[PDB]
Amino acid sequence: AFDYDGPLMKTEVPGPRSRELMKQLNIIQNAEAVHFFCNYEESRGNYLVDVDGNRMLDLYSQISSIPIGYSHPALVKLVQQPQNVSTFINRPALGILPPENFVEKLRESLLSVAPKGMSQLITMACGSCSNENAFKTIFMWYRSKERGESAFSKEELETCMINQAPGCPDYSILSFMGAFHGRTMGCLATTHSKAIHKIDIPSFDWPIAPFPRLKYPLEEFVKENQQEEARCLEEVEDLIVKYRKKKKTVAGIIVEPIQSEGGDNHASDDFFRKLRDISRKHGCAFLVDEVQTGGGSTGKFWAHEHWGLDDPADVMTFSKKMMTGGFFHKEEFRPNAPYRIFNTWLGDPSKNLLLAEVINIIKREDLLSNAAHAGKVLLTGLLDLQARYPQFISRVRGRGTFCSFDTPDESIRNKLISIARNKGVMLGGCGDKSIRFRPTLVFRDHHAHLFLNIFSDILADF
């Protein structure tokens, strides 16, 4: 009801039924990315069931977006309630016609986990439009700094309509190499993960700073890592200055607490505190992307909480585990006029309904601390495996269950993933020679041990 006791394999993955369904789907669209087809009705807890009857320990959790496992009894109970039916079949335009329980349900969910210093909340449907509207909020804010208390000039008003200055300023958002912030054309400009994401798509001439590449083991590279982070910070400042000279002023800086798709790249809390200070120094809005790191896998609900700041950022975006997307922000960044930050749905109240219960479960079952613990067990296991197989494993790193390690090359990475999948464990890859772990929040230490045993055998027979 809550979970299975272990993985159970029947066929290779993908199996014949999955291959048939993939053959079908491939007619109407490129289906090359598809791993296999799933039986979500029979999936439970940490275990994903496919259409061929295979039951796998899922450590990818739908690209880190399933918060408390599959078919959780609490959510099942939520959908079974008559009074909730409407919420699923009457989707409102939240900007103009919100439901009666909108504010209260927000108090039961998002507002109860608001980041320090951020009294404002705007909901969105995914991380991409979250980051887009964060960008826009920031541009509006910067221009507001520049012109306030003056009003919209007629020239601005008329030129903005035809995509020209001064109506459309030539401002920039600073981003980092290895970043990932979305696929829409605004987000994509700040994304620098893989070429296949970027190529043949028009972009923005915005500044791109290096993200620190830490050396491992960390306790043998203290000075080097310090110097690396310092270098990156100075290059950030220099980029801000350079682009101010270009009359392409940096209005904001966007960054992930942990770069995921770029290859699970970590940096010290000190680094982020200093980056925050730099952002404040040049009057740039500090935007933290917690779309992937948010939801408690790092041991705290938001990853940036590790930095220990009362003033951690100006804007923080979220999605995935949070069911709905959106962003928190300081009151300073509140738009002064309606219909500037706006779209049709602005999320979905049903997702809020699920999220309230998700958060209640996270709090009641103490899942943050559990993430810290289970993640520690997992990391210990990974370090053991690294010691025993230096020909296959290196740079074991992580925080909470947000863990990863590097393999020799991409082919070995994919072989390992494939074999693990056939052995009952679902894995995902970042960078693309790095194996990553994104388990759901009901992932316990014994799941860590299950995985570690299976993968141990795999490595022994590789």
Next chain:
Amino acid sequence: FDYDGPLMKTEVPGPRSRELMKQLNIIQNAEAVHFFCNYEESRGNYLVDVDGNRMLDLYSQISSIPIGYSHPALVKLVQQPQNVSTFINRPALGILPPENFVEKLRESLLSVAPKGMSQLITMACGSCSNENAFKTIFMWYRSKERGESAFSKEELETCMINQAPGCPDYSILSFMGAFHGRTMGCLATTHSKAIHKIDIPSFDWPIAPFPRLKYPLEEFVKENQQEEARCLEEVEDLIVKYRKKKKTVAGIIVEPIQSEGGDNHASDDFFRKLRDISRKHGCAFLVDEVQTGGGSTGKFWAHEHWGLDDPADVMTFSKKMMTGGFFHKEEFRPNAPYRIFNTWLGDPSKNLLLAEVINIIKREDLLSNAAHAGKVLLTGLLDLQARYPQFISRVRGRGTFCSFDTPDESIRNKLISIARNKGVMLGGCGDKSIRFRPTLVFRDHHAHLFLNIFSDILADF
């Protein structure tokens, strides 16, 4: 299923709505909020607010409610145990689709696919639909230019840092008065109102005139033909000019009926000629049916009115279709995975609802109904236009997709307010025009009800 009339108790917004708006205004700008709603009590064409008011809804959540509120078929859908999973286990559709994914697609979207378009990709809203359509078009164009060869090393290296040749300086041609979304790609092709555009970085992309027809149409045939010809010629000119600026037009995006720009119409001939121009210059033809799609014009997709066997290369949709996404020709199919991709790519629950919505639209013959009720509404509006020329002008529309102009700002706002207090919910476009976006269960007696109420309103104005 449906009430048989509006029922007002207070002014709108009433006290409870004002309190809730006060509460919401703490955490965000709530100035846009009309009032708070009781969706549990709403049924069919009638919206119920938190002050007990019941209004005839001719706005339908900005034209996104297909078959009315609390439809019994959808209720039944949510009541089934076997559907529970679908609502609580949201998959990363690009990599791990549910077993019934393809079949549910056959039951829904694939059953109303436009002519010539065998490909389909799902998205969660209109903005990412249009963005990914843009990207699909860019990819297709670069594919034409490099033709069945690998990405060069230079392109692979330059695209990572936002530079040519990896990042081409391609353009999408859009029209003045258009609206295609708020994200920074869509926003560049959007030209409806300045408050949408101001202070946001954009793209130097070609912007063409959209025809402004004169009414009555029967009294301005030649004039309108001249206007349309002018617009087409300016489009071709823009394509050439931007080709010469090394900012090649990879595609043209257009709405069958402009909406946020003030419900701007054009002849079917104009759109056929625009299609031809598109094919002529190697530009992909992208039709935005986010708002026109669903069947309010009397056919499922509005472009169907044009009568073309080859109406477009790509067509985007959302709103009424519960989920968003786009259809396209096989030749626009991405050559490799992970180029058009995101986490969710829509939502299987939306597909679940949509299959039933489409089933109802079919079985209840709601396209024809939209045509008929639309005709009744338009006739009525023409009558009121005749009787109150000092208030109503340029009465126009297709199916229930109708609209008209008022003398100015204030009159439009006042009329909407009075109509709302009288139990009729209306929306405004261009901030001068009143538009109608009724659900598909809007019938001719609802039209009469409205025409009637609004008639007395004009009489007392």
